[PDB]
């Protein structure tokens, strides 16, 4: 058995291509003298090929666009063969982490599994809004909080049993969502409970002004700053903001420019 380096993600394609070549050449004068070929997911970027002569390995891969042209094949020891073909949990009452949907990343208890053996019913702390803005994603979801049936009663619900309600077509029993997930959609290994899981389980600014005394008499402006007695008017006419005393200003109101009786 030789290993061969191939383009990442193209290992299954190379195994396929080798099979087509083998079957197409069976019984001809130039058979492909390989016995088998395979690719292990755990071993990214490699295909393994079974034969008697190295030349057959080169023959199997000739012209394959997914294989690195460098003469990189390597020999496997007989004592390493079976480990290449090693094929490899989940119990009711145990915890898993959800891998998809608004509950992605959340800890859940395994309640039960389907007869066929694919999806598992999970007990989950819900993330609900009680229909508050109706007329969901994992990035725009809700905080987790146990289902409250009286809140649902008040705001937006079918009773099914003691402590069991169907609310918006999902089932909540004693405050928890019970929802089926594909087993492939949950993580059962190396779960690390989090901290949180251990805990749980002046009236004239900006108004337009006219100046009635001084060298700037008759000009429009806006009150930029009115700290005290001395105002800052941003004059319109030249690009300058001036310091000015409060006796000098007329303010606009409902009827004309009004003195300091506004």
């Amino acid at each position: 058995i030789w290993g061969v380096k191939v383009r990442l993600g193209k290992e299954k394609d190379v195994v396929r291509q080798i099979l087509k070549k083998k079957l197409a050449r069976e019984g001809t004068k130039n058979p492909l003298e390989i016995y088998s070929a395979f690719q292990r997911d755990s071993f990214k970027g490699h295909v393994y090929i079974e034969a008697r002569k190295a030349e057959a390995i080169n023959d199997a891969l000739k012209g394959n666009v997914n294989v690195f042209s460098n003469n990189s094949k390597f020999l496997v020891g007989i004592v390493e063969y079976k480990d290449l073909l090693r094929p490899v949990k989940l119990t009711r009452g145990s915890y898993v982490r959800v891998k998809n949907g608004k509950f992605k990343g959340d800890l859940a208890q395994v309640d039960e599994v389907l007869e066929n053996g694919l999806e598992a019913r999970l007990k989950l702390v819900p993330r609900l809004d009680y229909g508050k803005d109706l007329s969901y994603t994992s990035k725009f979801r809700p905080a987790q909080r146990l289902f409250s049936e009286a809140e649902a009663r008040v705001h937006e619900i079918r009773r099914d049993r003691d402590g069991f309600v169907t609310y918006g077509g999902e089932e909540y029993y004693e405050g928890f969502l019970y929802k089926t997930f594909r087993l492939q959609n949950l993580i059962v290994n190396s779960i690390n409970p989090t901290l949180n899981e251990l805990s749980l389980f002046d009236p004239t600014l900006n108004k337009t002004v006219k100046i009635r005394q001084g060298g700037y008499k008759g000009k429009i402006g806006i009150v930029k700053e009115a700290n005290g007695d001395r105002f800052r008017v941003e004059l319109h006419n030249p690009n300058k903001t001036i310091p000015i005393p409060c006796s000098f200003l007329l303010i606009e109101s409902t009827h004309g420019w009004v003195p300091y009786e506004d």
């Binding site: 990035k139 725009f140 809700p142 905080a143 900006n206 930029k224 941003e234 319109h236 690009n239 903001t241």
Partner: protein
């Protein structure tokens, strides 16, 4: 929010032509919501700090993706003064 004045914006979020503006005044008001009331964040555009003038014209349209799209052109007049450069 920015430190400048917002009092020159109309209700459509856009300033109108004819209004004089000075530096750091907001001329286009825009917000972005904060992900998980009191939910948004300011994303407004202030006039460049060293400039002034008059808003001349405001284009409103949509872009290739269908969202709203604005342009604000400001005009001012530059008068020669000590330090300006000239050449034959």
């Amino acid at each position: 929010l920015k430190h400048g004045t917002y009092e020159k914006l109309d209700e459509d979020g856009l300033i109108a032509p004819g209004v004089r503006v000075s530096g750091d005044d907001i001329i286009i008001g825009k917000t972005t919501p904060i992900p998980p009331y009191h939910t948004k964040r300011d994303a407004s555009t202030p006039l460049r700090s060293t400039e002034n003038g008059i808003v001349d014209q405001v284009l409103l349209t949509t872009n290739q993706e269908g969202l709203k799209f604005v342009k604000v052109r400001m005009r001012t007049t530059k008068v020669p003064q000590i330090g300006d450069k000239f050449a034959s």
